[PDB]
Design a protein around this ligand. Structure first.
Ligand SMILES: CNC[C@@H]1OCCc2ccsc21
Lengths: 45, 227, 328, 286, 216
């Protein structure tokens, strides 16, 4: 039990953090909560 | 689930007759109710409508007051009060069920019908068909049916010859359940057509194109398809 | 004994904090989050909610014996589903928009069919296999349901069979939260021992353990990339963990907040997360800049659950006042 | 001289309108303050603002200007609104007392059946009494005496009217409140009466606290309701009879008929600004 | 928005609200009781005499007053995470067996103190019960009582012992101005046990009602 979790594939946190930042910066254009969308296209108006 | 109706027959002009549609296998207290009449040689013609618990009751111009309506939740029995009938009132009165919210399927399950004795027009009355080919039927509306919510209040109905019709495509873009999963439709405002892909057997019938934008509930002139 | 070696590997594999990388990135400033509607139908306090798959519907289950289905755009109520046990602590919406499952102190989480030829909601399969209350029973497919209980066991089921095909074991304490990966291949859960274990569905046994809290946990969610997740407990400490690196990344805490958490969620791109505290307020936090993006008022008692639709248009929060507010 | 009277009357009217409006605003904007008792209190508060706005300023005009200069129809309108509002502002107190008595005498009513319809029934009944009292002067029973002269906007001095109105508007409520709050006092006294030495000591000192607080509360309610009217009604009941005190001092009559109006300002304080739920709601909404 | 679809939608929403309101009104003219205690303290006998797979439910009728008793001992879990569902209950029925002082009653004391001084149960009055007084009588006339707790020295009289048990149970609550406790002795065959609960509930209702008027 403890052995199978003990022997796992582990990577440096650097490229993991880079992956998170890359996805965040690629999709930062599509946070309707974050970027204020003009009221002509929000159906809660 | 089954819906059965009674009250039909023959009444002399100026008389009164009571019309009913018994309920079984469902909760009448949580469903709307509608009535659509069809002449023996013409298309459908809507009659009235009842919301849940008879909160709201409308009528058409020609049936405003002279045919009143009611419902009975505890007993699951339907009432149609009629008086002073004329020659133009004879038609097939269809016990039609429906529900209204997001994801609705109005006019989904229909009764057998009763034998009692915006302008919408369809392009072609009758079109022959051949197995394995592709044939399309178009429908035109006087005014754009797109409402402010984006919901196109367009329906296509198909009635097998001599049987109660079914829901095939509702909202002109969504496919009803229980269909053979072949039919499809597309178009834009006041410009719509029904496309049949890989037509097969038992598809002979009549297709109906009706509006729901405003509330006169007027149907099309009819579309006949024959082998 | 292996624990020391695992900890040594953990401290060896970590070198940098996300703050260093974000230090070259300017924050997105202040955003104005204003309420659009308010939903008022519940009498007793509400306990759960689950957003639909088409970003237009949601369900909420309350203690007055009722769970209810809304239309989020016009605030029209469409379904009222009477219950059998007045103790309901969880709810779920099927991805295909067909089923809803809920269950509480009695050792069950039932099944309801929405799209019925009957035209009314009925109970289909009463799943009874635990010796404790169920805190969360979500959905994988239209035919496999995953239940998490106060029985210190997470149970994967199969509705048509009626019997659990697989069982998961490994928590000393009782689990109270459960979340699914986007690919429907793995899922995680956490318990009162302040540990979260990555559960596999293929072979039915845990893979890795995630620790760092010191109290019972309240809710969790995956990062939308399918690689990380963030957790919330009663210590006012939202913590972030990823599948790959198996490490602690960012601690989400502040010195002027002292109450606990009740539910969490991520935004569409994961730029910012939510947390509805015990002081009847929500709190939007930059998921990368780690600074408080804003505060939302609007309730009086205490936040119970919240979530964001698939497309990101909306966010809805619930509280013990029995009021649901839709935000934008 | 007249400026002082004007400013004082303006201050009183402002206080009346402010208090009566704030009470209704606080009740109408919360969900924790919508039980039957608080409905009764709010409805009493609404009748008070009517009286204030529609009657107080005209009476202040009649006072400072020292004469009536508005016309016969205006005078009849004023006297009428006066009677109705000041008679529906009395009986609400006895309605509230009846509510509390029914709460304390039998719990099974308090749980098994208590619907918010009772508040509406009681409010309708009180306004019904007001309507009944104010109409007879308009229908008839008015003296044919001259009233067109300035400062003649007075109330009819028929013996029969000035006894019937006085009884049916102030004295029956006095007996009703006396009896109902006396029975509530008896019950509340019965409940309190009905190592371990320290347990006994706690019991005694607790009982001493609770046997004094009830005296204080019942006394303040009773004392305010009697002191803020009874002098006016005894004055209005003696003078028409046998021309008593022919040289009646009008300067005292000013205070005598200002107490009846001052009840409007005094009423909201005792019933609304002591309930802990209102204090908390006021702190919240402010 | 002037289409039959959304008019029907708002109609359905209005009726759902009305149905929910009626149900919420109906389920409030009812008194809810949390029946709590140890497993073998005599709960079942209480259940039978009062009446005349996790949480268990109970229903009554007694002179135009409706009760509701829950049983929370069947399941074993983290008590701290399902107790808040029980706010607004009028009274708590704590059942204790007297015979078991020498078999445990110390654990009953620890449980009583924990349940009474709950921050969520600050202002709920407590009904107490004491069962199996018979076997208590045989045990005390066969064996002494000081083995349970040597700090007490006194006669072996059943009156003095029972009074000491009552006083020991009652001296636990820290707050007394808002919460008061009623005791009662039961010999496992009584026709006067429902009456005690009726009287306790009536007293609770009256002492609460007098509070909002400013009296008491
Ligand atoms: C001064 N305002 C009250 C008014 O004074 C005249 C007699 C009377 C009877 C009922 S109300 C009333």
């Amino acid at each position: 039990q403890l052995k199978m979790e003990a022997n796992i594939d582990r990577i440096k946190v650097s490229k993991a953090a880079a992956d998170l930042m890359a996805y965040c910066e690629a999709h930062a254009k599509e946070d309707p909560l974050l970027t204020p969308v003009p009221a002509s296209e929000n159906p809660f108006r | 689930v089954q819906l059965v109706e009674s009250g039909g027959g023959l009444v002399q002009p100026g008389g009164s007759r009571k019309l009913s549609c018994s309920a079984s296998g469902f909760a009448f207290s949580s469903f709307g109710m509608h009535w659509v009449r069809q002449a023996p040689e013409k298309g459908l013609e809507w009659v009235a409508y009842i919301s849940s618990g008879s909160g709201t009751i409308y009528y058409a111009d020609t049936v405003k007051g002279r045919f009143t309506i009611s419902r009975d939740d505890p007993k699951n029995t339907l009432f149609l009060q009629m008086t002073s009938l004329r020659s133009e009132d004879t038609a097939m009165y269809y016990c039609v069920r429906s529900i209204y919210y997001y994801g609705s399927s109005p006019f989904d399950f229909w009764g057998q019908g009763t034998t009692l004795t915006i302008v919408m027009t369809q392009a072609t009355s009758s079109v022959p068909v051949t197995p394995g080919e592709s044939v399309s039927i178009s429908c035109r509306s006087s005014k754009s049916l797109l409402h402010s919510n984006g919901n196109t209040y367009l329906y296509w109905f198909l009635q097998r010859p001599g049987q109660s019709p079914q829901l095939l495509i509702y909202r002109m873009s969504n496919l009803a359940s229980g269909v053979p999963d072949r039919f499809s439709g597309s178009g834009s405002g006041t410009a719509f057509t029904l496309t049949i892909s890989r037509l097969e057997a038992e598809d002979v019938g009549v297709y109906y194109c009706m509006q729901h934008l405003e509330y006169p509930l007027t149907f099309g002139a009819g579309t006949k398809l024959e082998l | 004994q292996l624990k020391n070696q695992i900890r040594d590997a953990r401290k060896a594999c970590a070198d940098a904090t996300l703050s260093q990388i974000t230090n070259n990135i300017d924050p997105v400033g202040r955003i104005q989050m204003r309420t659009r509607r308010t939903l008022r139908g519940h009498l007793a306090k509400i306990y759960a909610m689950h957003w639909g798959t088409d970003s237009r519907l949601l369900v909420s289950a309350s203690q007055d014996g009722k769970l209810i289905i809304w239309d989020s755009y016009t605030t029209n109520k469409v379904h009222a589903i009477p219950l059998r046990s007045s103790w309901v602590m969880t709810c779920a919406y099927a991805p295909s928009g067909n089923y809803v499952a809920c269950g509480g102190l009695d050792n069950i989480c039932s099944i309801y069919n929405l799209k019925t030829r009957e035209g009314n909601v009925r109970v289909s399969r009463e799943l009874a296999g635990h010796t404790g209350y169920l805190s969360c029973c979500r959905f994988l497919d239209d035919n496999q349901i995953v239940t998490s209980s106060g029985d210190t066991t997470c149970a994967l089921w199969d509705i048509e069979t009626g019997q659990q095909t697989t069982t998961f074991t490994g928590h000393t304490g009782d689990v109270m939260s459960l979340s699914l990966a986007p690919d429907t291949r793995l899922f995680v859960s956490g318990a009162c021992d302040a540990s979260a274990k990555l559960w596999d569905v293929r072979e039915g046994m845990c893979r890795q353990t995630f620790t760092g809290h010191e109290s019972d946990i309240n809710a969790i969610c995956f990062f939308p990339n399918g690689n990380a997740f963030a957790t919330g407990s009663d210590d006012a400490t939202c913590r972030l963990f990823d599948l790959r690196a198996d490490q602690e990344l960012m601690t989400y805490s502040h010195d002027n907040i002292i109450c606990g958490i009740t539910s969490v969620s991520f935004s569409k791109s994961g730029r910012l997360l939510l947390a509805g505290y015990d002081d009847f307020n929500c709190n939007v936090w930059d998921a990368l800049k780690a600074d408080r993006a804003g505060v939302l008022a609007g309730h009086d008692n205490r936040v119970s659950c919240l979530g964001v639709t698939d497309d990101g248009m909306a966010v809805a929060t619930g509280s013990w006042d029995s009021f649901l507010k839709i935000w934008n | 001289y007249q400026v002082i009277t004007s400013l004082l009357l303006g201050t009183l009217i402002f206080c009346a309108v402010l208090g009566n409006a704030c009470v209704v605003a606080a009740i109408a904007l919360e969900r924790s303050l919508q039980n039957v008792a608080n409905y009764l209190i709010g409805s009493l508060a609404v009748t008070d603002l009517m009286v204030s706005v529609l009657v107080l300023p005209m009476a202040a005009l009649y006072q400072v200007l020292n004469k009536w200069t508005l016309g016969q129809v205006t005078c009849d309108l004023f006297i009428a609104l006066d009677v109705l509002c000041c008679t529906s502002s009395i009986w609400h107190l006895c309605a509230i007392a009846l509510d509390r008595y029914w709460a304390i005498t039998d719990p099974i009513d308090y749980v098994n059946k208590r619907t918010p319809r009772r508040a509406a029934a009681l409010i309708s009944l009180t306004w019904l009494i007001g309507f009944l009292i104010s109409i007879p002067p308009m229908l008839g029973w008015r003296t044919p005496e001259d009233r067109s002269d300035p400062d003649a906007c007075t109330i009819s001095k028929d013996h029969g009217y000035t006894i019937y109105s006085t009884f049916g508007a102030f004295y029956i409520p006095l007996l009703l409140m006396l009896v109902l709050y006396g029975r509530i006092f008896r019950a509340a006294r019965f409940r309190i009466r009905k190592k371990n030495e320290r347990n006994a000591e706690a019991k005694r000192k607790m009982a001493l606290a609770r046997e004094r607080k009830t005296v204080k509360t019942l006394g303040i309610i009773m004392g305010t309701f009697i002191l803020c009217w009874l002098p006016f009604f005894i004055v209005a009941l003696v003078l028409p009879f046998c021309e008593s005190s022919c040289h009646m001092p009008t300067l005292l009559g000013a205070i005598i008929n200002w107490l009846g109006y001052s009840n409007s300002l005094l009423n909201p304080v005792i019933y609304a600004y002591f309930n802990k739920d209102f204090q908390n709601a006021f702190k919240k909404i402010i | 928005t002037l289409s039959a679809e959304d008019k029907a939608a708002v109609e359905r929403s209005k009726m759902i609200d009305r149905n929910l309101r009626e149900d919420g009104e109906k389920a409030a003219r009812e008194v809810k009781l949390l029946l709590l205690g140890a497993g073998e303290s005599g709960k079942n006998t209480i259940v039978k005499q009062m009446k005349i797979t996790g949480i268990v439910e109970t229903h009554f009728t007694f002179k135009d007053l409706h009760f509701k008793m829950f049983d929370v001992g069947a399941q074993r879990s983290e008590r701290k995470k399902w107790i808040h569902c029980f706010e607004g209950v009028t009274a708590i029925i704590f059942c204790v067996a007297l015979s078991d002082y020498d078999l445990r009653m110390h654990a009953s004391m620890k449980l009583f103190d924990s349940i009474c001084n709950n921050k969520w149960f600050t202002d709920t009055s407590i009904i107490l019960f004491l069962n199996k007084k018979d076997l208590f009588e045989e045990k005390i006339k066969k064996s002494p009582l000081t083995i349970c707790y040597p700090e007490y020295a006194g006669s072996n009289t059943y009156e003095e012992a029972a009074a000491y048990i009552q006083c020991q149970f009652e001296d636990l609550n820290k707050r007394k101005d808002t919460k008061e406790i009623y005791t009662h002795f039961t010999c496992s065959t009584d026709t006067k046990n429902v009456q005690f609960v009726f009287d306790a509930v009536t007293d609770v209702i009256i002492k609460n009602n007098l509070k909002d008027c400013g009296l008491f």
